[PDB]
Symmetry: D2
Subunit: 116 residues, 4 copies
Amino acid sequence: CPLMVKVLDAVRGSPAINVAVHVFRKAADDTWEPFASGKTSESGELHGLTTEEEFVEGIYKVEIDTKSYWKALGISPFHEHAEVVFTANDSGPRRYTIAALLSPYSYSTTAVVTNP
Amino acid sequence: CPLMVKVLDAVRGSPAINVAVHVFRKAADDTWEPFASGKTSESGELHGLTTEEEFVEGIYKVEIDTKSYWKALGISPFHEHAEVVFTANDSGPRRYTIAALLSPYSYSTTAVVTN
Amino acid sequence: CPLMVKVLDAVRGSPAINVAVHVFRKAADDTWEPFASGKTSESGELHGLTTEEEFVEGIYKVEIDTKSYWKALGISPFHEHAEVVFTANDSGPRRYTIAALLSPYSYSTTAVVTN
Amino acid sequence: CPLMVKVLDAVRGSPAINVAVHVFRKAADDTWEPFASGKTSESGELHGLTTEEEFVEGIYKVEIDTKSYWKALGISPFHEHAEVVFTANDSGPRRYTIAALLSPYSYSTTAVVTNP
Ligand SMILES: O=C(O)c1cccc(/C=C/c2ccc(O)cc2)c1
Ligand SMILES: O=C(O)c1cccc(/C=C/c2ccc(O)cc2)c1
């Protein structure tokens, strides 16, 4: 798993379950091409987005659909989504975990990057 | 001042000074059109981006150029930039402060919306 | 104003108003002695805690009563309070702002230290 | 594992390894009694602090020794430690993960609380 996403809910003190995530990769024409998508599990984790072969060098955008998440729980949140944009694999293959901690008017995101 | 941006540096414990910030408004065709921009001041703040008359309801994106900030400090960062995307709503309070707290591999952001 | 405290609410997107804050200074016997206290204002800020003359080098603790804040909003929170413990250092910049961003099961805190 | 601690480094984008953690529990006389201690592993996790039997109702303080961590890496940080104080098990046994994300002048902490 070269790319994993983990989402936590700071209101409930729980994993954020069933959060939609869309990943894009910048193409040669500078547009955002759809790359992979999925949703978080009961553990707040999303695995299996991509493979070592497919996850080449590039600029990637991980869009976490926080608004849709909060609305389903009866909260009208501030943000449309949380976007995480980064260059990947520019010094060879790495494993990336993108973590996000969500509140209705705030989020934090961090990356853990390891060398296989 | 319906929209203010404040940026802080979690490594040095200081305002993040001279950070480029670009604001975009989402157009009818879903593209992002430039709306306003500037650089944070010595206090890490950017005022005067827009006016009440111009800041109508709509979807806005605030892009903070965090990569350039870290590179100028000799620090290699993770993100290309920080992006804060939100809907302006007239029902809610009138003044929006978008705050961002920056680390090389992490950022947080919150909105303080008041009257 | 060598020491200011600012508290924000990440659920409502607002200042955290009327939050009790207590500051302690560590004594020679390692106990925490009361130093200053107050409640945050309508802007979520607490000014006037101390003076330059009184705020000497030492270890300080800022306790923010987050539990009472959430309970007053009908929300069950995790922490008893938020505690920020730090050393005041004369070598560094003169003004300390301790900021805290509150959620029911999480808080963040940063220091903005300036001249 | 009713109590687990996980620590991440926001400067390096990595687990925070070898971070000392001391847990205290408030006694009947209102003093903080030493309860358990340990340090984070290569994954930034600390397991095995306590047991279901030992981890009774109480007010607990988890002190994460962030200053000692940052100093070893050549950074003079702001905080002495990060303290996390909470009532545990007041509605029956729960599993607690205390997570902390560290920077030299800032930290964030969150709790994930699950029912076994
Ligand atoms: O709004 C101001 O005037 C203000 C002034 C000084 C500090 C801050 C901090 C905000 C913040 C953002 C994210 C986070 O995780 C913690 C704190 C805000
Ligand atoms: O890496 C994991 O598996 C993991 C597991 C459980 C919790 C977390 C939390 C991360 C986090 C993110 C943002 C923040 O502000 C504080 C903590 C990460």
